[PDB]
Design a protein around this ligand. Structure first.
Ligand SMILES: CCCCCCCCCCCCCCCCCC(=O)OC[C@H](COP(=O)([O-])OCC[N+](C)(C)C)OC(=O)CCCCCCCCCCCCCCCCC
Ligand SMILES: CCCCCCCCCCCCCCCCCC(=O)OC[C@H](COP(=O)([O-])OCC[N+](C)(C)C)OC(=O)CCCCCCCCCCCCCCCCC
Ligand SMILES: CCCCCCCCCCCCCCCCCC(=O)OC[C@H](COP(=O)([O-])OCC[N+](C)(C)C)OC(=O)CCCCCCCCCCCCCCCCC
Ligand SMILES: CCCCCCCCCCCCCCCCCC(=O)OC[C@H](COP(=O)(O)OCCN)OC(=O)CCCCCCCCCCCCCCCCC
Ligand SMILES: CCCCCCCCCCCCCCCCCC(=O)OC[C@H](COP(=O)(O)OCCN)OC(=O)CCCCCCCCCCCCCCCCC
Ligand SMILES: CCCCCCCCCCCCCCCCCC(=O)OC[C@H](COP(=O)(O)OCCN)OC(=O)CCCCCCCCCCCCCCCCC
Lengths: 345, 318, 115, 172, 114, 70, 105, 96, 83, 98, 51
């Protein structure tokens, strides 16, 4: 690489969502989305393998099409009302096109097909940057239009994203695809609670981000790609196992881990708004999510898969783990349930 | 009366470009220690007419491996764009007065490049493909340079019109305030017209005929007419922009005469350049523009941004 | 309406010229005449194969610089503004960052026709 | 002379239909050049000429680089124009017939008033300041230099970052 | 909703100036300096009350003072004003810079008389 | 010698003088002894339309002076 | 979410061109300046559901100004009745509407 | 030389715009009177001869605001001839 | 400095286009900051009257604004006349 | 104006259908993307000119700048695809399914 | 969970790089024939070109 273009690209990656979430003009939100996409593409295609090229191409055409639909919605709103924000009396067709295009930006089902494809064939840190940072700007736009959303389309997208994410993560054995389907399921939960409480989708987004940051960090430590690769972790880094298991259980939503809190409070708000059918279906598919997490836990922690001869040399060498980032986020993402009234806002 | 005005614009321009072919052959001959044509006419003045009649009485010879639609569309497109580009020039009163005259000029020039590209791709031959790709590279380089040059010069001017250029150059030329822009604009007009040194699209030595290698007589004559009309037009645009003719409200005939003299001088300068210099390589043209003219014209564009601000000489809107 | 009439007259003139060129002379068409030229031999390829241009980065840079041109072109109306200090600063910044991009590409050998 | 803008909009629809029908990218760039010229004419008819000429120049440069790339890599031995498959021509004329059918339906259904045959050409330009200087398009694009410096700086940073982005993508 | 009220042809009738734009521009400065009170009254009512239907008397006063100004011009000295406005009418933009001599003669007229 | 190019140069000279001179003369003939009266802005177009309405022959170039006022 | 760094820092990056009746370049208007001004002054301070309820008159006037659906329908009805009367021979247009009028400046 | 000549041209432009300013109120008064005349003749021609349909108000506006709304070009030239409507739509644009 | 002068002289001999471009860039930066005519451009663009000057009401409490264009009050343009 | 805006919206819809329905050519997909861009530019310009929103006239220039940036990135990715395979076929780039 | 519709799949490579060599660049063959002005009347210079 080169430090100058590293600084330019990473600053533009930062600047995109910041402009989107701090700008009150829909045009400036759109140019923030464009900033994020165009800046993150060279970080995706960096290893210059065919898989990286394919992932960059798929991501580019998907996000470009979705952003074009977003800009269509903005221009139609400007035609209808003369302003640059959906105020209160816009067209429901415009709002539904906005929701559909932002769903394809976010990557929730049935627009979810590219997300495991792009997450596969991409290095783990770029998968982390995608699955955490790229989902804040479209969520910021969705939170900005908090009323005047179609709850029917919202709930349909939410339920199909949770269903398809649970099934996909159940099938997959590649770790990056597992993380992508986890992303799809949690985005389904956030979108489900979006029209009733912006605070709860913000809370679920924060819980998901602080939960899947150290999961990706622990994958990044040993460059573990598959279930077998994470299975020979007892020989590589045996101190990782308890935190890995606790974070996987917290992603599953088991009490008393703090990952139970977003699902619990979202179910509470949906009970307050009388959507028991959707809440029950979402909870059962979250149990399916917990099943594929628990199979991962069986592979990596509660059993000891066979190891090979060169792991002796791996034990001979020395390692390095980031301070202030892994352990802090792991503790805050596992043992922060009794601070639930402070976490909800 | 307007159709009569169209005729008195179009027909003299076509006769002027035919005699530009004659003047080019004679000037190149006399710089080559020989004569020009002096047998066909009294002094060779019937030579372009004989050439035109021969080209329009030879068969056009449609080829087999050829996209016929684009193959026919491209030369007619080139000729109509050359005449459309001739439309808005003021001498000192234009046939069609446009507010954004220079923008119209730039758009029409780019569309002429498209005519060359479509001819080269439609005539499904390797030398035609080579000529089309060379045209792509050439127009990349001169397009960016020409846009910056015109931006700085018309920032010294007021609006994007051309009667405003006449009123700006009423007292003094624009060559003295911006002569480096005039030099780079002259080189860019050479590149736009695909003339020597850097023709590179009809390269007789590197290629056989470039993009015209499959065009037989007829549409080939149309391409030649478009090219030479563009030569006279770029020289006319250069003398309107930079070498401002004398304008008096009572009589415009001396303006037309001064414009004629300077346009003839710059056309003869084009033929002079062709006689003098060898050909560039088409990567060397891109390197030359993007490494010498583009930084200098970016700096001079910044200087001409700053100049009316610190001299308080901002031009009027009208 | 006037410009429209002149455009249509020029188009009709070019069409008339090419129609005269196609219907005036005598036609004698056969296969060896209408074969592609290729300097007196049959072409090996089909002239539609990939060409692999060598200045692709320069072409993409040309796209970006053309849009920088589109940004820079409203300057003749921009200099008529009432502020003129923010206008001058903004024009300086725009030209400077365009020049910085060109300089960075030149240093990183972007416009060097990699074969 | 009233339905001139409607004729232009129909031509733009036809050009976008051809671009959607996806010829060889040579003819796709041709269709986009024609559509860009037609949209320029529409903007010029509706008002200021600067925006139309800008989009025309920009798309001329863009389709030129596109032509170079589809000659370089996005080509094949027999580039289909439109007649390699009769389905493409049949679908083009089917879309044209559907366009005529829908505009006839919306003329017959004149309650909403989106398209009216008798009222066409009557509501093109709504209200204009008859006496007035400096009210044409391009003054606002100039006001990007003084009143929307945030728009100017995000566009400039987009182009700068784009230079860095394309160098790093095609670094190889 | 309500019926929009607007005046009739009888109250819209006025003695129009029937004077071309070139002669108007030739006399523009002295017209703008002679009765600027009436014109500014009309502009003040027009910008305060956005309705044009409640400034018709002020508009008729503007027409009246313009007619009086042109009648004074026609009565006192007419031929240098005539040659001045025809020289202005000659050019395509009515530029004052072309015919400053006739402008000087007309200014000498309106300075010696009136 | 070198002056043999002067016939072709003179033909080009007259063919470049003709269009501008003819355009100016045709503008004068069509506009009645005056220039084209170009209208860059809406104010100038309004002046032209007002002149066309004032003249009464639906021609903007027929200038009306002080003879219309008694 | 929606950060408010522009309101916190007091700057206006993109807030002066949010709507039509806002800071035109020289002194111009946007063809519905009065209607949009009345609608915004109605809706300010009570925003959301109350602005949707009890500023419906101002919003309907502004939407009618901007889109002109009712004026189009009224003019179409007038022209349709005129054409029907022309077909039935019961109407002759006046000279000023059809043909030569007396031009006033 | 360009500095001096551009300053002189700025002075000339200020003189021309001041002539325009001095002529502005007369044009404003005549324009308002002509607009009101066209609206009144349209209102009368719609009133007496055009509309005998039972459910129709003649001078009914489409706004509740009961103030002056300036008419559209298609509103004031709608009953006029098609050539006049086309001149009002594309006069300045096509004049080139 | 010797090395700086030698480098600049070598650059002026060998690549006298980048030297000219950087010098012109620096001159265009510096010259507005030292010219005494910089304020005059903004003042000229302010004084150019593209709009009608809308009159104000006479409440009798403002003596600064004039009562007629032929008055000593108001922003006179004698600086532009003598510029 | 409403008829023209309906035509422009239908043109955007056609270009969106072209983007969604692939025919073996990533370049043709990028062409459909830029057709969508052109339709949006014409819609925004016509709306601003009709409403006299001269303050919002920089919006089409902004969307043109960002659209050309995304077209630049797409052309660079197409160059990388062609270097990888040599055919530029969207069905040929498919190996991330497992 | 391999089925009849996915039994032909393979696991991804560990380093996300797989061998996909074609070597089918097909450099353009152009002959400077014995009619080219650059050719000295009589020369068939067959050129393998990469652009
Ligand atoms: C509604 C009216 C608007 C037009 C649409 C209807 C008519 C055209 C339908 C599409 C036809 C496409 C077609 O046949 O393409 C085949 C042809 C290619 O065919 P070809 O040329 O390869 O093969 C023909 C060979 N012969 C003659 C021997 C049979 O492509 C074109 O015609 C496209 C050329 C451009 C057309 C538009 C030009 C506009 C002006 C540009 C400057
Ligand atoms: C239209 C008006 C007339 C114009 C001139 C027409 C007549 C003359 C025609 C001559 C023949 C042209 C035929 C084509 C030639 C093509 C080759 C060519 O020109 O290459 C360009 C050549 C290139 O030279 P080069 O390519 O040999 O350079 C070597 C560079 N390397 C090693 C990297 C390859 O020159 C230029 O680029 C110069 C452009 C003009 C520069 C003008 C600078 C003026 C001074 C500025 C200010 C200086 C002071 C600084 C501040 C001081 C403050 C106090
Ligand atoms: C520069 C602008 C204008 C350009 C266009 C030129 C305008 C002036 C043209 C004047 C001459 C017109 C006739 C040219 C005929 C050229 C071809 C020719 O001689 O064909 C012979 C042929 C002879 O036909 P044929 O009957 O012998 O059969 C031809 C086939 N062979 C010989 C093998 C048996 O055609 C004609 O004679 C047609 C004459 C048409 C005259 C139209 C007037
Ligand atoms: C062989 C096929 C060739 C096809 C391509 C033809 C190319 C033509 C030449 C290049 C044109 C490039 C674009 C130019 C657009 C016009 C430029 C312009 O500024 O127009 C605006 C102008 C009036 O604007 P303005 O100057 O502001 O005046 C107001 C007060 N004076 O003027 C106007 O408003 C006039 C608007 C119309 C002007 C263009 C008319 C074009 C007509 C269609 C031509 C093609 C038809 C299809 C093919 C026919 C069959 C081959
Ligand atoms: C703010 C910055 C922008 C301001 C506006 C100016 C825009 C200039 C844009 C281009 C600048 C690029 C500079 C770096 C670069 O790429 O230099 C390359 C060049 C050598 O490349 P090349 O000429 O191709 O040589 C081939 C093999 N010898 O390298 C050289 O030739 C070396 C040149 C060294 C001297 C540079 C000029 C110094 C001038 C100082 C002036 C002080 C007063
Ligand atoms: C409506 C959505 C469906 C449109 C179907 C169009 C025809 C079709 O089947 O296209 C599929 C084709 C796939 O790509 P291709 O490589 O051609 O695959 C060949 C398939 N063996 O894809 C293509 O050829 C791309 C087609 C793009 C079409 C865009 C424009 C659509 C215009 C028509 C809209 C719908 C009209 C419906 C009319 C019904 C009857 C009145």
């Amino acid at each position: 690489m080169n430090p100058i273009t590293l600084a330019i690209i990473y600053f533009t990656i930062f600047l995109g969502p910041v402009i989107t979430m701090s700008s009150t003009n829909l045009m400036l939100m759109w140019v923030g989305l464009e900033f994020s996409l165009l800046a993150i593409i060279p970080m995706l295609i960096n290893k210059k393998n065919p898989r990286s090229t394919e992932a960059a191409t798929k991501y580019f055409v998907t996000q470009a099409t979705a952003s074009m639909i977003i800009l269509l919605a903005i221009v139609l709103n400007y035609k209808q009302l003369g302003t640059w924000m959906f105020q209160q009396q816009t067209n429901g067709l415009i709002l539904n096109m906005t929701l559909m295009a932002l769903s394809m930006k976010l990557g929730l089902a049935p627009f979810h097909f590219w997300l495991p494809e792009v997450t596969q064939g991409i290095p783990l840190h770029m998968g982390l940057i995608l699955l955490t940072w790229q989902k804040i700007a479209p969520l910021s736009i969705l939170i900005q239009i908090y009323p005047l959303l179609n709850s029917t389309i919202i709930l349909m997208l939410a339920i199909t994203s949770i269903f398809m994410g649970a099934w996909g993560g159940l099938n997959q054995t590649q770790m990056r695809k597992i993380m992508a389907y986890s992303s799809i399921a949690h985005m389904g939960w956030m979108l489900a609670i979006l029209p009733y409480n912006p605070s709860l989708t913000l809370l679920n987004l924060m819980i998901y981000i602080i939960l899947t940051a150290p999961m990706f960090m622990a994958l990044m430590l040993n460059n573990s790609m598959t279930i077998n690769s994470i299975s020979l972790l007892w020989n590589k880094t045996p101190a990782m196992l308890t935190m890995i298991s606790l974070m996987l259980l917290s992603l599953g939503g088991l009490p008393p881990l703090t990952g139970f809190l977003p699902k619990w409070i979202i179910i509470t708000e949906l009970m307050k708004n009388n959507c028991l059918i959707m809440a029950t279906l979402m909870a059962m598919m979250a149990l399916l999510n917990l099943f594929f997490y628990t199979r991962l836990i069986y592979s990596t922690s509660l059993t000891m898969f066979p190891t090979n001869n060169n792991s002796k040399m791996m034990t001979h060498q020395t390692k390095t783990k980031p301070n202030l980032m892994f352990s802090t986020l792991a503790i805050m993402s596992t043992m922060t349930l009794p601070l639930a009234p402070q976490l909800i806002t | 009366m307007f159709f009569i005005n169209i005729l008195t614009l179009l027909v003299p321009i076509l006769i002027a470009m035919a005699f530009l072919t004659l003047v080019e052959r004679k000037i190149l001959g006399y710089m080559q220690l020989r004569k020009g044509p002096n047998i066909v006419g009294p002094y060779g003045i019937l030579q372009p007419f004989a050439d035109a009649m021969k080209l329009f009485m030879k068969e056009p010879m449609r080829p087999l491996t050829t996209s016929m639609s684009l193959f026919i569309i491209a030369p007619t497109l080139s000729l109509t764009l050359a005449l459309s580009l001739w439309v808005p020039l003021p001498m000192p009163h234009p046939l069609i007065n446009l507010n954004l005259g220079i923008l119209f000029i730039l758009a029409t020039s780019s569309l002429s490049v498209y005519s060359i590209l479509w001819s080269g791709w439609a005539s499904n031959s390797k030398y035609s493909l080579f000529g089309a790709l060379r045209a792509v590279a050439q127009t990349i380089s001169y397009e960016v340079t020409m846009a910056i040059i015109l931006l700085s010069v018309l920032l010294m001017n007021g609006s994007y019109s051309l009667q405003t250029l006449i009123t700006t150059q009423e007292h003094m030329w624009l060559l003295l305030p911006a002569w480096p822009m005039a030099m780079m604009w002259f080189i860019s007009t050479l590149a736009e017209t695909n003339r020597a040194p850097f023709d590179l699209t009809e390269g007789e030595s590197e290629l056989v005929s470039g993009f015209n290698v499959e065009y037989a007589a007829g549409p080939f004559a149309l391409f030649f007419m478009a090219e030479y009309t563009n030569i006279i037009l770029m020289n006319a645009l250069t003398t309107i922009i930079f070498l401002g003719p004398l304008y008096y409200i009572n009589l415009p005939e001396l303006y037309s005469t001064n414009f004629m003299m300077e346009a003839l001088l710059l056309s003869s300068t084009f033929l002079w350049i062709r006689a003098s210099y060898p050909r560039f390589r088409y990567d060397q043209l891109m390197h030359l523009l993007w490494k010498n003219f583009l930084p200098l014209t970016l700096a001079l564009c910044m200087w001409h941004i700053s100049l009316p601000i610190f001299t308080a000489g901002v031009p009027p809107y009208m | 309406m006037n410009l429209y009439t002149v455009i249509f007259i020029n188009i009709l003139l070019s069409l008339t010229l090419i129609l005269v060129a196609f219907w005036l002379p005598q036609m004698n068409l056969y296969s060896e005449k209408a074969n592609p030229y290729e300097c007196g031999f049959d072409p090996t390829s089909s002239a539609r194969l990939p060409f692999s241009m060598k200045f692709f980065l320069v072409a993409i840079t040309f796209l970006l610089f053309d849009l920088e041109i589109a940004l820079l072109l409203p300057l003749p109306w921009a200099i008529q503004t009432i502020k003129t200090s923010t206008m001058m600063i903004m024009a300086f910044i725009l030209v400077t960052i365009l020049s910085l991009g060109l300089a960075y590409e030149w240093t990183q050998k972007g416009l060097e026709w990699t074969e | 002379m009233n339905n001139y803008i409607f004729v232009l909009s129909s031509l733009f629809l036809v050009g976008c239909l051809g671009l959607a029908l996806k010829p060889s990218p040579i003819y796709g760039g041709l269709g986009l050049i024609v559509s860009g010229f037609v949209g320029c004419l529409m903007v010029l008819g509706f008002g200021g000429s600067f925006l139309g000429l800008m989009v025309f120049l920009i798309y001329l440069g863009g389709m030129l680089v596109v032509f170079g790339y589809t000659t370089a890599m996005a080509t094949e031995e027999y580039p289909e124009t439109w007649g390699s498959n009769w389905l493409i021509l049949g679908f083009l004329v089917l879309g044209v017939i559907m366009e005529v059918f829908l505009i006839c339906v919306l003329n017959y259904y004149d309650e909403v008033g989106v398209i009216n045959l008798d009222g066409l050409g009557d509501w093109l330009m709504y209200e204009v300041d008859d006496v007035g200087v400096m009210l044409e398009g391009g003054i606002g694009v100039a006001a990007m230099y003084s009143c929307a410096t945030w728009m100017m700086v995000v566009a400039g940073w987009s182009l700068f970052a784009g230079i860095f982005i394309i160098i790093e993508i095609t670094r190889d | 909703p309500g019926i929009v009220e607007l005046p009739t042809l009888e109250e819209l009738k006025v003695e129009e100036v029937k004077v071309s734009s070139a002669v108007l521009k030739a006399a523009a400065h002295h017209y703008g300096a002679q009765c600027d009170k009436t014109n500014k009254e009309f502009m003040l009512c027009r910008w305060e009350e956005k309705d044009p239907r409640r400034c018709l008397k002020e508009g008729k006063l503007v027409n009246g003072c313009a007619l009086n100004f042109f009648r004074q011009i026609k009565s006192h000295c007419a031929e240098p004003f005539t040659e001045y406005w025809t020289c202005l009418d000659y050019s395509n933009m009515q530029l004052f810079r072309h015919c400053r001599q006739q402008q000087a003669k007309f200014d000498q007229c309106v300075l010696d008389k009136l | 010698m070198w002056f043999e190019i002067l016939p072709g140069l003179a033909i080009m000279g007259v063919c470049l003088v003709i269009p501008g001179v003819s355009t100016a003369y045709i503008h004068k003939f069509t506009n009645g002894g005056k220039e084209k009266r170009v209208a860059r802005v809406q104010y100038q177009w309004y002046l032209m339309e007002r002149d066309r309405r004032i003249s009464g022959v639906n021609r903007y170039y027929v200038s009306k002076g002080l003879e219309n006022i008694d | 979410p929606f950060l408010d760094i522009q309101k916190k820092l007091g700057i206006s990056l993109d807030r002066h061109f949010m709507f039509l009746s806002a800071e035109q370049p020289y002194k111009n208007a946007a063809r519905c300046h009065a209607f949009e001004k009345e609608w915004i002054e109605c809706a300010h301070g009570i925003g959301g559901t109350r602005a949707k309820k009890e500023c419906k008159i101002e919003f309907d006037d502004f939407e009618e100004c901007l889109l002109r659906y009712k004026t189009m329908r009224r003019m179409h009805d007038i022209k349709k009745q005129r054409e029907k009367l022309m077909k039935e021979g019961k109407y002759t247009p006046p000279p000023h509407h059809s043909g030569r009028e007396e031009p006033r400046p | 030389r360009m500095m001096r000549w551009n300053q002189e041209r700025r002075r000339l432009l200020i003189e021309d715009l001041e002539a325009r300013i001095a002529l502005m109120p007369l044009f404003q008064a005549e324009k308002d009177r002509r607009t009101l005349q066209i609206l009144r003749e349209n209102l009368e021609e719609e009133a007496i001869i055009m509309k005998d349909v039972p459910n129709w108000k003649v001078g009914e506006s489409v706004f509740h605001t009961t103030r002056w709304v300036p008419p559209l070009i298609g509103e004031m030239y709608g009953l006029r001839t098609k050539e006049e409507m086309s001149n009002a739509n594309f006069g300045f644009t096509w004049y080139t | 400095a010797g090395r700086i002068s030698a480098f600049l002289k070598n650059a002026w001999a060998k690549e006298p286009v980048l030297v000219v471009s950087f010098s012109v860039w620096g001159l265009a930066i510096i010259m507005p900051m030292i010219s005494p005519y910089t304020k005059y451009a903004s003042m000229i663009n302010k004084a150019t009257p593209y709009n009608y000057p809308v009159p104000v009401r006479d409440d009798g409490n403002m003596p600064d604004v004039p009562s007629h264009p032929q008055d000593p009050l108001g922003p006179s343009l004698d600086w532009l006349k003598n510029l | 104006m409403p008829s023209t805006f309906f035509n422009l919206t239908m043109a955007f819809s056609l270009s969106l259908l072209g983007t969604l329905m692939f025919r073996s050519h990533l370049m043709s997909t990028l062409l459909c993307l830029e057709g969508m861009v052109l339709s949006l530019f014409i819609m925004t310009s016509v709306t601003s000119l009709n409403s006299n929103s001269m303050s919002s006239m920089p919006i089409p220039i902004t969307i043109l700048v960002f659209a050309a940036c995304e077209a630049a990135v797409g052309l660079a990715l197409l160059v990388k695809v062609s270097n990888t395979y040599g055919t530029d076929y969207v069905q040929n780039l498919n190996l991330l399914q497992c | 969970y391999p089925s009849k519709e996915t039994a032909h799949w393979k696991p991804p490579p560990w380093n996300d790089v797989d061998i996909l060599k074609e070597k089918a660049v097909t450099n353009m063959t152009l002959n400077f024939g014995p009619q080219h002005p650059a050719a000295h009347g009589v020369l068939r210079l067959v050129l393998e070109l990469s652009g």
